Amino acid sequence: RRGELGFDDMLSRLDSALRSESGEVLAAAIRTRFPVAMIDEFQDTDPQQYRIFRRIWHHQPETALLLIGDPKQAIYAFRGADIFTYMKARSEVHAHYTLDTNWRSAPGMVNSVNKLFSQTDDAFMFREIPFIPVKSAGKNQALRFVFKGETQPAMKMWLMEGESCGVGDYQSTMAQVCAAQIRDWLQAGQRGEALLMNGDDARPVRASDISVLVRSRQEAAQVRDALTLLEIPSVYLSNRDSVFET
């Protein structure tokens, strides 16, 4: 009645247009428009989007479809994405291609990730999501986070000691342990003891290098309160609060 439109209303209108009988010819017009498609971030794909892309580019000749994505990064299920659509797409298509080389992290962290996720079979508990061991880069094989004592390992699982603990006490103890490790890295980093070494080049660890990865706002405020007690300033990048509420 008002004539307005929404973000998902465009997808619903295109799916209803391709659902009709004449709109198939419209799909041929799309085959006249772009005889190719390269779809990035296919893990964040609604079923309407995949129904459209199957309506246009299923089996027609001279048109190519390239679904470039990652099933191990589909974390937007709260937004509307769905991994079962990706499993249906993997069951429908025939060819699969993967990227072997990893250019970001040190080979110690890569070996830790390939060791932790390949303990059992089907670690993602689904049959259509297999895990493969990725390979580290040749240019980044000399990355070392060195401490005052010796070379610090990649993954350090700080096991909190005790039989049974609550939620708030565990969060407070692990926030205090993280703040103590942060202040130890900053106290030894300003004297040239804790370093980041690429081959022979060295860099002291500043406050911008250490980052705490949380999941909720309450535990982020807990980390910020446990870190501001030791005279360490910290920023919250995920702060979406309005300026008018201050």
Binding site: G3, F7, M10, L11, R13, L14, A17, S20, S22, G23, V25, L26, A29, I30, R33, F34, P35, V36, A37, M38, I39, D40, E41, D44, Q49, W57, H58, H59, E62, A64, L65, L66, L67, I68, G69, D70, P71, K72, Q73, A89, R90, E92, V93, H94, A95, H96, Y97, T98, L99, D100, T101, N102, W103, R104, S105, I132, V134
Partner: protein
């Protein structure tokens, strides 16, 4: 599964690329864009070379689309310079220059791609849906 080479990918039918975390996905996308522009691959190539306004790239995040458009523009300019000079400093650009036999027609096509880079068909999902609803409004029934 098999390993993915950007200069040996058959661009026929439906293909599923699984790019892991930290891999060069935007570089592989730019390599496949240059492959679709110049028409490289031999037997696994496209039947005809396409222009900039015929390659459709769909990415969800708008900043990712802007970064990919800027990177593809920079790659087009670098490949045009490397084809005019018959030399480059990148090994993938070296293999791209080794795959082509002609240099003048490829340089003219890269110059026309640089001039038509503003009219590139690299949009988002909702932007592509709105453009298809506004373009063919008769068969769809959109205002």
């Amino acid at each position: 599964a098999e390993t993915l080479d950007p200069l040996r990918l058959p661009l026929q039918g439906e293909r599923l690329i699984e790019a892991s975390a930290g891999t060069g996905k935007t570089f592989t996308i730019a390599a496949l864009y240059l492959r679709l522009l110049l028409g490289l691959g031999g037997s696994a190539a496209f039947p005809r070379p396409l222009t900039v306004e015929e390659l459709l790239v769909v990415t969800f995040t708008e900043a990712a689309t802007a970064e990919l458009r800027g990177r593809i523009r920079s790659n087009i300019h670098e490949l045009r310079i490397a084809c005019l000079r018959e030399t480059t400093d990148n090994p993938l650009y070296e293999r791209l220059l080794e795959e082509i036999d002609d240099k003048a027609q490829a340089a003219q096509w890269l110059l026309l791609a640089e001039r038509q880079m503003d009219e590139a068909a690299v949009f988002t999902i909702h932007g592509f849906c709105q453009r298809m609803l506004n373009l063919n409004a008769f068969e769809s029934g959109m205002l």
